[PDB]
Structure prediction request, 2017 residues.
Amino acid sequence: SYDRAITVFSPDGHLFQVEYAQEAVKKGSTAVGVRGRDIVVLGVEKKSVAKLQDERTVRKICALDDNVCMAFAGLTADARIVINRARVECQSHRLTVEDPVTVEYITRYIASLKQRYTQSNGRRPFGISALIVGFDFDGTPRLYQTDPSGTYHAWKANAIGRGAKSVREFLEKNYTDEAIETDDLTIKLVIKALLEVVQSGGKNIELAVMRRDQSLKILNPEEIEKYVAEIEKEKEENE
Amino acid sequence: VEKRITSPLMEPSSIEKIVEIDAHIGCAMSGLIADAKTLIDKARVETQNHWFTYNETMTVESVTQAVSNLALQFGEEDADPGAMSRPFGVALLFGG
Amino acid sequence: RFSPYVFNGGTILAIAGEDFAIVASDTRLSEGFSIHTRDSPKCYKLTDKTVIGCSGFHGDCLTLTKIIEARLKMYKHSNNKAMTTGAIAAMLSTILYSRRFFPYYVYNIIGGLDEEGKGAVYSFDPVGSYQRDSFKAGGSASAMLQPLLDNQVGFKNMQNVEHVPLSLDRAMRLVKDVFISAAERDVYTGDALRICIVTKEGIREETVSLRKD
Amino acid sequence: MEYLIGIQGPDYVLVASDRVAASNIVQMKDDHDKMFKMSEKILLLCVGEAGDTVQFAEYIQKNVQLYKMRNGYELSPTAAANFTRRNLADCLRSRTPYHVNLLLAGYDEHEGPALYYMDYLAALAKAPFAAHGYGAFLTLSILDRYYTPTISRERAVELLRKCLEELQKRFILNLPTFSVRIIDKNGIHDLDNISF
Amino acid sequence: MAAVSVYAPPVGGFSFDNCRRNAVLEADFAKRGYKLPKVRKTGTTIAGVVYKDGIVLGADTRATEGMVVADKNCSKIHFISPNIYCCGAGTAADTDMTTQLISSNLELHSLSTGRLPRVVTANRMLKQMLFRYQGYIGAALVLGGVDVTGPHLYSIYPHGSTDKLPYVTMGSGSLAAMAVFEDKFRPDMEEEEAKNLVSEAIAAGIFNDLGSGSNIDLCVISKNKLDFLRPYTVPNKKGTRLGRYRCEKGTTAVLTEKITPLE
Amino acid sequence: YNGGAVMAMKGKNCVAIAADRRFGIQAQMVTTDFQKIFPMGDRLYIGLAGLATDVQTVAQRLKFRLNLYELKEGRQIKPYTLMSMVANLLYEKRFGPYYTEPVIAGLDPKTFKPFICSLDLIGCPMVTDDFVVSGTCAEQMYGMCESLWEPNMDPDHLFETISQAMLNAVDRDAVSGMGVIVHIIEKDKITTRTLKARMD
Amino acid sequence: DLLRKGFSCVKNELLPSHPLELSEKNFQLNQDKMNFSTLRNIQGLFAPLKLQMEFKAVQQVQRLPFLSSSNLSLDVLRGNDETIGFEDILNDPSQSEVMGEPHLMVEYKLGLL
Amino acid sequence: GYSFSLTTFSPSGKLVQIEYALAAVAGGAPSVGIKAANGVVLATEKKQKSILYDERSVHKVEPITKHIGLVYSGMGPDYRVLVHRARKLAQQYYLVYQEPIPTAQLVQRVASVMQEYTQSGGVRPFGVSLLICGWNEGRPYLFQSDPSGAYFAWKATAMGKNYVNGKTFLEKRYNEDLELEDAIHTAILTLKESFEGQMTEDNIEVGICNEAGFRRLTPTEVKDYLAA
Amino acid sequence: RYDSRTTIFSPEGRLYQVEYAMEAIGHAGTCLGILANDGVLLAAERRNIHKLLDEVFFSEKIYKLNEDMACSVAGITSDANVLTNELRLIAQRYLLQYQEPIPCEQLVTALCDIKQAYTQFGGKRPFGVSLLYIGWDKHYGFQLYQSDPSGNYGGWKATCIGNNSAAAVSMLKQDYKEGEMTLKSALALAIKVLNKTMDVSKLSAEKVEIATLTRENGKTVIRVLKQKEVEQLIKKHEEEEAKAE
Amino acid sequence: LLDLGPGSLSDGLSLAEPGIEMLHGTTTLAFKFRHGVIVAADSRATAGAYIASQTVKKVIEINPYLLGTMAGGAADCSFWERLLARQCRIYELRNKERISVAAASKLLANMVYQYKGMGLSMGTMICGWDKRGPGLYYVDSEGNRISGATFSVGSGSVYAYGVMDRGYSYDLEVEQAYDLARRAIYQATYRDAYSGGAVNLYHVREDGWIRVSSDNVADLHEKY
Prediction:
């Protein structure tokens, strides 16, 4: 009847440790994913810059296969475990049903793994939510969102972690046909959405994008810093 | 069944409230759909196993009986492999 | 050093008409050069509409017929209906294949009525490849029986002959005569002839005599 | 059987395999790509008995890809060769290994080109050139004859053509086409099939 | 990186796996090949007596790989316990490892007990091990020692059977050694007499057998003294070399030379 | 099958370990640079001889154990202990034998006393004072070393003796040869030479 | 019908590698049965029930399977604290020499997979 | 609170169950170990006070191999189990490597075994701390094993009850220059500083370890030593 | 909801057992590592200050995991021993597979997987040990890595774990020649850091365990600094702060 | 009680002369011209020298997307394509899209790879019209899984190879391809002794196979 010992239903039925791993992703770094016509974008803020930290090892935008890339929020260690399992699953599926795995299939596998740590008083639930995004073999963009409970609803434009509804409900009124027609136009959408909750500027706003049939390509503060280049893209052409 | 979409950004087709157990059984979910996903998997696997062993279409009553057989294994943790340790959290409507 | 198998002999035969399905078998149980008994029928009644007849190694015949009866009862309990003929045949194929690497040295022929009441006969092999046929024969004497059935039932190799539908009386005459012929040349066949007539009104059994030698 | 051949030059690796997949006195297919792409710069020529070749090659390919995606960089050719050897050696026990004769050919940005020979017992050995199948006997002398450590790509390809022509001249089996790829600083390069 | 494949190697202890490779690598047999090494037969004439107040063990020191004398000073009197010794015949590695493990077991026993171990204990351990292993561990041992209950002499056969005798002989030259004992043995010999008898008995197995012959070892175990006489006698010496082969410097040609200073 | 031959020789504070260089499948030379002498320490080498598939496995089965030993205890291993764990590794597969016969040769790290040994495929410590041999050419090395060996040979004469033993023993065996490698371990330095052998 | 784990099959293997394959690999359970039959026959059913009952709760909490374990209390419950055999020196589980992913090995212990 | 589980770190992050086994050791029977320049002496305090108790049966300074011995202060049965498995470990190492086990390796393995009970749940940590002496290629060794699994190398230390004052007593009484014959005497003095009962013949058990290996002193030799 | 079972999420999201595991680290000896252009050092405070102790052998908190990379510990020292053994075993296993020394991230992640597996399915105490890793590999060169009982980790250019960690990291952030410092300039910096995180007791070579890693002649060198070098470094920093007046 | 047959002995989850037998399969065929794949096979199944049946449907009807083929051993095939059909249907249920021919062939090959050299005698040939185009694979008992334009397996496979190769062309209009398959199977059953009966003919067009005809070789002999 309490928070306690996952395998218990509340007298209403709110089996609580899942309700808390559900709320465990309210302290992770905000993650955003917007799916365009020919591009899928995946942006994560990093307001733990910790200047003397190697920006490469803390990176949160992981890749699951040639056609699937992943973001998350919450307990990083659980995320690493589930990402390792998902990568092994992608390769195993390509070994037996040889084809690039559908974004649907790997999303369902991750959700099933998350769910399988909800029975069996046993384990504790994974404390992360994932934004599975990628292109499928038939050539269409996808975007998915898992939860510690196991639900895997697929969206068109998402946000998890700190400031969840802030980003999402900003993004309610900004997803349109004239936001996915051209690629950099799609990019500027996610940038502005993250800037709504950003730690005041492009402080390690770890963006990675994916166009059709090529790769995951983490945009990085290049000699041009497309990060900043686009920050004052919007911050010039706002007026 | 009502679907109760939360936000416009959500794909309606993603919300999976009516599934195809087989060509002649339909199912409706309500509750912790995380559990419905394993119950429906059990139902589909059982229907196909019955068709494989017995060259016939599995009757609806037997499908729901097998799915119930997946339930009622609430606590038997002496039986180690992969038990629920809890009742499911879903109510089902097998039509066929 | 131990032959897990032995051939007990025995012949079976099935005919599928329009309203019936004859299943007949000799009742001589043999081993090597000895007659264990002369009154061991090799046709078993499964359901009011389906009759199986096994031949070959007798131990596996007993075990298989008991497994099959148990499986019909389990099906009746879980699904709340008696199995159809086709379902029983598919089950039997599955059961036989489960011992692919230690086969059931039995030849099985299912004779009975399908869902619509027309006759149907299913013929098997020691590891469960079944198929629907209008008639069949298996066991030691199958090689003697099958050509004659092809001639008289399937009208093979005859020209300008009216394809009369096979009547129950003519089916009984044919089965009795083919086993009279078979008892003459095959040493494993004789001493009696249990014939099961599977119709819509139940299963009635006729038994006649063969050469006793 | 079938035929593999590999040549290592200054800064490249040339490999060639037949395209015939026979099942009996008949050949079932004549476009058999016997060449598995481990990574962007590694090629794994696999031959041997039917069934085991494809399964073992698929296993190793999936593992090299899995390592690449789990880490970000890629297995070096010597690493891939040693890992494959460890995998094949351990299966010389239960699942009656797999009689897969391998020929791993790859390039590293750091170590230069590499060619590894592997019998069905998992006996790894780096070599400047090698070959498998009964055809190896006929071609290895010709390889010994005109091979120098310093060979331009065109000289290497005409040497391979010499080997294949003589294999056509003598070898009793019918091997009409051979797929050829070269491996250098820029990925894997397909070359025009040598046909007769 | 702890790769996901075998659940784990949670149980060591005698592989098998990797035996079908042995089964189908006829090579040595059919397909020419035949490098395919085979094992050993060390322990070729070992003998023991029970003199008045102790045990005298003996053994030759030749170890033959195939039909080539591999070792010329292979010790075959193994140490079991400060008062128990054991000669070893049969396959070499099996005898070695078996005696070492039994010594460890036995002196753990004597350590926890706090008194001198009895011979019968070692006899039981060896018997039960060999019987457990169904005789595939071919290891013929002559067990000898002196506990509080007087001298004891056992002869353990590979299959598990053990025989307690006043005198035993084992090895390829066992029969030739048994001849001396059956003709010269008396109960209640003195130390020097028993040593001479065993020396002759092993000497019989040296000159009159092919699988044996080298220096002679003895182990005189008494109630209070333990002399591990090694080597007790040098009957055979290398024939003096007449030529002066004496490879000179620069005689061999060297293509490449690499030098590495270590310290 | 694959072939192979290795020896060791003791001397005046110096040992010599040698090996052929043929890696061939049963008739067919494939490479002439197959490694059979593996460094297991500053002055401690092991030479394997047998199946190439098991030379490559035992030498890596044993490097794993050796590295763990060294890290756990923090000292370079004495040759005798290395000898004793090869017996364990080999005897582990008593009924599944690793078809190889290692020879271990080196110097004691703190005493610089020569040490050599030889093991059969199931593991039987055989410490000798003059030399050990292994491989297909089993008789030929025995015959050569029993004649050329001398005690208390200075390193250059040791190198001459082991070089002649190799060169004249592998030349009389079809499935071993294609050059000879020789390592002379001293209290100060390691010399690795490749000798001139018939390449037929 | 899968892999990425060595295609767990061994169906070709089936027959033991030796009359000394299964027996020597599982002589621990064989000796357990020997002693239990010795105790069921002469001492009672209570003694085998005690041994099962205890051996259950000496293994439940030692360490997670992906790490090495000593299993102390089990050894001095059977006579193994002063009897040491070939299963202790050959390929000790401390240097298991083959491991998988920790999680994936600690779940099957209970039997999730 | 929080002092119940052995698997529950305190909010202060300190393991209270192992915190308690230390108190059990500190409530045990005193023991002293000294490293002399050529050997090690272990001396311990006997609770077999009543005349009915025997010395011919149970011993505390109890050997592991030809050159390693232990002494404890804590719960006797837990000792006996620990010494049994230390003997296992030494013999395992001796079979694997034909070499007497180094003292440090035996200490590390025994400490790992002891820790393996500190983090398991449903068991308890050993209620003993071990003092281990050894002799390996010409230098003495002395180690103390904490119930948490920690192990330390001491030139000289005291343990069991009233150990802090025995630790301080050894301070201005120990140095490089002392050697085994004098080490015995100073260890005896360290014991009687807190013996509480004015020792006689077998109120104590003493062991030594020079290259002649570990050896337990017979009561006559201790009697010789108590004469001065 | 509370501090139990190491597998319960409090009603506020925080794994209280792990938060308590990262509390024992705040009591162990201060340990810091600094990354330099030409090498890596790993200094540590050896809090076994008692004088009767012996066996100064190579380490009390500075272990070596393979031919290339070394480790440091902080926290419950027995669990640290277990973890170091597991690290050595994993490194040897990777070397056995691919016949190359393990890249540092490979081993760090392999260990963090176990350490997280203990903060999940279980019922057992999570490993209360926070580590530091120094090593080399051909993929990225010199690397430094941290770990918490939580299983988290991260590559750091210069960090510190243990007692007085906050002040040390603050001084390191404000004090670091990031990307353009040589080795023993970083050694002087490390001495300054430890001089910041003293107890009352002024430090001396009897209270410090500096160790260094170096890229030389194709072989990796981990030589723990001896007495004389450390005392000389101490006098150097002492004069430098003296004239800093 | 000794063993006392417990109950239904062992039969649970079977899904993954003296008894030694399983009938036979023979002379199948398929090629992949521009208008889709067509599959042809005879209808005969022998047992030693004795025909057990003349009406054996050798073209397994896996699902209305995809066909199989029996050859080498009748029961082994029938069972393994039946289980493959089960797996294909489960996949189509879960992922809501028909499984591609490449995937199904790999499923069957992996399923049959286990039991390697344990006695299976499968000679299957998967056919279908997947998302990528026509599909055609030769999955057999020893693990071969090869695509290709044309195939034929069975005791009389070689004769079919002959006639089919000299008749084949990728730009072959439909009704001529029908006649080509008829002729190839008829010649194969003319020479071979183990092949006979009726020449079944399937066309794998766009979505959905269809059945072309089932002519008897006795009538074809008169036809030619």
